[PDB]
Nucleic acid binder design. Structure first.
Lengths: 153, 5, 240
RNA sequence: AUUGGGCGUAAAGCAAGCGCAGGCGGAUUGAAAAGUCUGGUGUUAAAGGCAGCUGCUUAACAGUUGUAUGCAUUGGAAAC
RNA sequence: GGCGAAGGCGAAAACUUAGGCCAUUACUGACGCUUAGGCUUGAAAGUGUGGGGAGCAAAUAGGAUUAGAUACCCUAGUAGUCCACACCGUAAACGAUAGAUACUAGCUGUCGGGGCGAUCCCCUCGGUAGUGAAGUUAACACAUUAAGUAUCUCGCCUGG
RNA sequence: GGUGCAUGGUUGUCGUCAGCUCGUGUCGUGAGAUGUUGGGUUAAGUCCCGCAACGAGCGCAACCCUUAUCGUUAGUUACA
């Protein structure tokens, strides 16, 4: 359980008599055991926003099965003109990613990884791309079972 | 799935 | 016996051009007349599978939900089965969101139990106007939440008369992991339904038989007397 | 942005057609393999780095050892 | 609605001319597509020559008007508005989507050709839109003729 | 004494006009919303009808007194 935030956003509702600033925040809840979720909540002060985002992210928790500590294939994460390349890292080389991106990688409990950024990388875009990538992955045992092969490589 | 448990 | 041609007094006749192309593949290779027809044998086996699965589920001591909200036909059938079998049911229209949002259901039914227990306990505790208002709230609760006040937890199984026509029900069922059965129509999506039961519901002469057979299933599963689903005759139920 | 981007409202489709060259090009059979891959051989100095060793206060560094693009000849390969 | 390469094409008669839709199991034997370059046409307006100018109307005249008006306002009025011979080669020349090619839900259609045939209707073949699944984009929206899936070729894009 | 384009407070005002926010769940990545929309009922978001809405909070809401019918405790400094 880590419950790591990404960034606080400020907006304003265009209404005369006081432009309402009910600004939104986004938090990510994980446990480094495959459980991943994230929630965005709009509120007025810090504690209410923090609590609403915690509820939203923790209630939306869903687990993703963990392979060996690093991914075994390269994959592209595409969301809102923002792509991120994931490449396998041998279990002794190291993990290279950005701060929030590294937080996302750790939140899944995955070890050393290789990453690369493409496009405009506004943090919500990167979060969506990472979500897509972790949901678009294919498994070796799956292709081995749905097919007829014993090697399972 | 055809089980509930 | 069980779901043969003798019991089937109507299996086709659904109004045309309201259909799903992939529901033209699971059932009834396309008719030249383009009238919405349905298959006999595949529906029979699907119904048998639903019957045995709901039997097993009831033997697991689980909760079940039954639905009916049509003008009078399906509503009358579901009311008859509700006073016959203790299952969750809604006599009136779905509130848009009544399954996905669950905490609001819990608070509504807690207030419903408060009102019911107050009315039962009350010998002289409110004025005439106050009692009239409380009875108005009681009646409003009976309209929608009254059919589900009997059970106070999520029903583990549920039927749908028409998932596309009950879009809210099918959406809220797909929100959850609960298995669902549905009288699938030619303009439905089989992937939205856990167990396919392709049958005509817009023709009431078939949906009445389906409702009776599900009533038989739940009654026999609940160790209660059963009226049909193994019988060489069935009563006529036609619109007048 | 071949590798490694697009062209509707953002920068992007000539106003359109004829439209040569060129590019891309229906199927089947054969050979040569020109291209291509590949085998033998030669050459591609040293020095540069990658790695090992030695001399250094470990050290940068110096020396030792090998590592290679690429080209040519010759034997094949036949899918394209 | 149809003909269309677009721009565009409607009071009608004839002459000449292009292409079209529908099936060709008959023919040729890949002869096909794109397109550097080149060629042609290409709204309107406008310039030159001959006509003539119904109607209005650039410029210009008088009159309102506001503080001011060579304006929106009113009455005029010239060029021009037409075609034949010459040119111009541009646009919101837009469907804001280059061409050619293949596949892909579904529904409502609409027209024409083929047959059934009394119109109606049926499907087939082409044009033709709307709806709409999936999918696509940030969205709008596209959505079987896509802005989906892609290929070949050309042309363009690189902050203001 | 000045200083309400520097204020507190207070008032006028739209207006006794039906409109104004939050919790949960849902469309969407957002700027937002669904309830708050559309039909009937009142002055009224007052209610329900249908409806991704269900609920809750403010206004509204109504709980006051006088009157209108009667009765009750009490009777003058009313009656008489």
């Amino acid at each position: 359980f880590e419950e790591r935030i990404v960034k606080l956003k400020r907006i304003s509702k265009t209404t005369k008599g006081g432009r309402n600033m009910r600004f939104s925040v986004l938090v990510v809840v994980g446990n480094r055991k495959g459980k991943i979720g994230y929630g965005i909540a709009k509120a007025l002060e810090v504690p209410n926003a923090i609590k609403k985002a915690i509820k939203a992210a923790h209630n939306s928790l869903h687990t993703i099965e963990i392979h060996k500590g690093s991914i075994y294939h390269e994959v592209i994460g595409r969301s809102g003109a923002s792509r991120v390349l994931l490449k396998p890292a041998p279990q002794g080389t190291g993990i290279i990613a950005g701060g929030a991106i590294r937080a996302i990688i750790e939140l899944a409990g995955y070890s050393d990884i290789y990453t690369k950024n493409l496009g405009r990388n506004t943090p919500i875009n990167m979060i969506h791309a990472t979500m897509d990538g972790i949901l678009k992955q294919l498994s070796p045992r799956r292709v081995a079972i749905l097919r007829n092969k014993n090697l399972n490589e | 799935m055809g089980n509930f448990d | 016996s069980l779901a043969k041609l003798g019991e089937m007094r109507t299996h086709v006749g659904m109004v045309k051009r309201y259909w799903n192309p992939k529901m033209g593949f699971f059932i009834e290779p396309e008719r030249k007349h383009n009238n919405d027809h349905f298959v006999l044998e595949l529906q029979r086996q699907s119904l048998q599978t639903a019957y045995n699965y709901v039997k097993e589920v009831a033997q697991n001591n689980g909760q079940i939900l039954f639905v009916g909200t049509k003008n009078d036909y399906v509503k009358k059938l579901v009311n008859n089965i509700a006073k016959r079998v203790d299952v969750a049911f809604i006599t009136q229209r779905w509130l848009g969101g009544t399954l996905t949002n669950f905490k609001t259901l819990s608070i509504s039914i807690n207030k419903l139990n408060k009102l019911v227990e107050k009315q039962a306990e009350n010998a002289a505790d409110l004025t005439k106007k106050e009692n009239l208002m409380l009875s108005r709230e009681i009646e409003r609760l009976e309209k929608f939440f009254g059919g589900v006040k009997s059970l106070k937890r999520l029903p583990n199984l549920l039927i749908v008369d028409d998932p596309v026509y009950e879009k809210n029900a099918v959406a809220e069922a797909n929100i959850l992991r609960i298995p669902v059965v549905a009288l699938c129509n030619t303009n439905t999506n089989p992937e939205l339904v856990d167990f396919i039961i392709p049958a005509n519901n817009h023709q009431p002469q078939s949906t009445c038989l389906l409702m009776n057979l599900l009533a038989d299933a739940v009654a026999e599963a609940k160790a209660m007397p059963t009226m049909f689903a193994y019988k060489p005759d069935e009563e006529i139920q036609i619109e007048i």
